[PDB]
Amino acid sequence: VDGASIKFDSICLYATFFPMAHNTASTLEAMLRNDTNDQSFNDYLSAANM
Amino acid sequence: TDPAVRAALQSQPSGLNSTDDWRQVMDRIMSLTARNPDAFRQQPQANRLSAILEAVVPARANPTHEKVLAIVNALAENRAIRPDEAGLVYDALLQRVARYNSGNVQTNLDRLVGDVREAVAQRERAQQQGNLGSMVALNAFLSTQPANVPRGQEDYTNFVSALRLMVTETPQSEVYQSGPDYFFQTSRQGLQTVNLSQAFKNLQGLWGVRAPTGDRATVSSLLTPNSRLLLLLIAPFTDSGSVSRDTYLGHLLTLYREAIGQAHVDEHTFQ
């Protein structure tokens, strides 16, 4: 009720790639695809809210 | 790390002491292990139960990735592709298998991992065994060369056998043909390349007539330096009496053989 307003003119997504030695990156990519080396994550406020 | 593509693979798709080797886990969980018994009896409950639950009913696994990675690694260690190409071709083969899969395909894949393991081992031992390709090239060149020398023949064929023995007995030596000539490199990325065709052409005229003329350095300039290197490389071979002595060629061979000899001997002595 105070006339505050905001518009998005444009938006872009940025990313940063670590320049890895191609053979090392290739072997890492090979290893990371097997089931035994799957990545896992959890969350700090592991929780639930109510 | 390890050349055996099975071993150099299985480091990548595997846990550590999981229920892939069921017998060891079952031995350790009851009491059977003697190295450190009662280890499992005193872990937290969850862990204990979970192993036990894993042990009584094993969980099936999908070994497609393991086999495909094994064959890819075999290709990489055998110079079939570059390592970047290895990273790409792993996914390529994975898609290929996944879009045509069948029990027959898995059977052929196991056959193939066995075959590539054997292939890598064979390639390594053959590369350390003498490089038959050089022998084939040398035999082709010798077929190109004539086998008859009007002045002297025993020395010529003795020298030919000596050269054959030299190329056979030292692996990593290269014999090939680049232009309209055959050559002999004592090592990959190595100096001392001998123009074999030119050396034989020059040496054809010195076989059976340089024995009486060895005392006077009147024809000594006929020996082109390339052929001199060729003779120098065969000093350890063609031991005394193989080439008839009192011959300019024989004299050079004997001198070179004596020189190299004092050297290696003194060297293993060192200190």
Q: Comparing C-alpha atoms, which of B66, B183, B80, B67 is closest to residue B123?
A: B80
Residue contacts between A and B (CB atoms, under 8 Å) = 43
For the four alpha carbons of B81, B87, B89 and B90, in that order, the dihedral sign comes to positive
Residue linked to tokens 């010529």:
B156
The Cα B163–Cα B263 span in angstroms is 22
For the four alpha carbons of A28, A31, A33 and A38, in that order, the dihedral sign comes to negative
Q: What is the 3 state secondary structure string of chain A? A: CCCCCCCCCCCCCCCCCCCCCHHHHHHHHHHHCCHHHCCCCCCCCCCCCC
- Contact yes or no for B222/B202 (Cβ under 8 A): yes
Is the minimum CB–CB distance between A22 and chain B shorter than 8 Å?
A: yes
The Cα B161–Cα B147 span in angstroms is 12
| Chain B residues within 8 A of A29 when measuring between CB atoms | 87, 90
Q: How many CA atoms lie within 13 A of B234 on its CB side?
A: 28
CA distance B219 to chain A (A): 59
The Cα A39–Cα A33 span in angstroms is 10
Domains of chain B, CATH where assigned = 1-129 (1.20.120.1500), 133-271 (no CATH)
Is the minimum CB–CB distance between A35 and chain B shorter than 8 Å?
A: yes
The Cα B234–Cα B242 span in angstroms is 12
A28 token code pair: 């890492």
The Cα B113–Cα B65 span in angstroms is 12
Query: Which residue in chain B is spatially nearest to A20 when comparing CA positions?
Result: B84
Pairing of strands B182-185, B174-177: antiparallel
A18 token code pair: 């670590």
What's the longest Cα–Cα distance across chain B?
Answer: 98
DSSP, res B240: B
Is the minimum CB–CB distance between A23 and chain B shorter than 8 Å?
A: yes
Contact A30 B66 (CB under 8 A): no
The Cα B81–Cα A30 span in angstroms is 15
Query: Which residue in chain A is spatially nearest to B86 when comparing CA positions?
Result: A26
Contact A25 B87 (CB under 8 A): yes
- Gyration radius (Cα) of chain A, Å: 21
- Contact yes or no for B20/B55 (Cβ under 8 A): no
The Cα B91–Cα B69 span in angstroms is 9
CA distance B65 to chain A (A): 6
Query: Which of B10, B71, B90 is the mutation pick for testing A, counting most A CBs within 10 A?
Result: B90
- Contact yes or no for B163/B176 (Cβ under 8 A): no
Cα→Cα distances B38→B18, B22, B29, Å: 19, 19, 9
**DSSP letters spanning B162-217:** HHHHHHHHSTT-EEEESSSSEEEESSTT-S-EEEHHHHHHHHGGGSSSTTTTTTST
Contact A30 B14 (CB under 8 A): no
The Cα B71–Cα A12 span in angstroms is 42
- Contact yes or no for B33/B75 (Cβ under 8 A): no
The structure's method of determination equals cryo-EM
**DSSP letters spanning B92-148:** HHHHHHHTT--HHHHHHHHHHHHHHHHHHHHHHHHHTTT-HHHHHHHHHHHHHS-S-
| Chain B residues within 8 A of A22 when measuring between CB atoms | 83-84, 87
Q: Comparing C-alpha atoms, which of B212, B207, B196 is closest to residue B163?
A: B196
Determine how many CB atoms are found less than 10 A away from the CB of residue A39. 5
Contact B83 A22 (CB under 8 A): yes
Contact B69 A37 (CB under 8 A): no
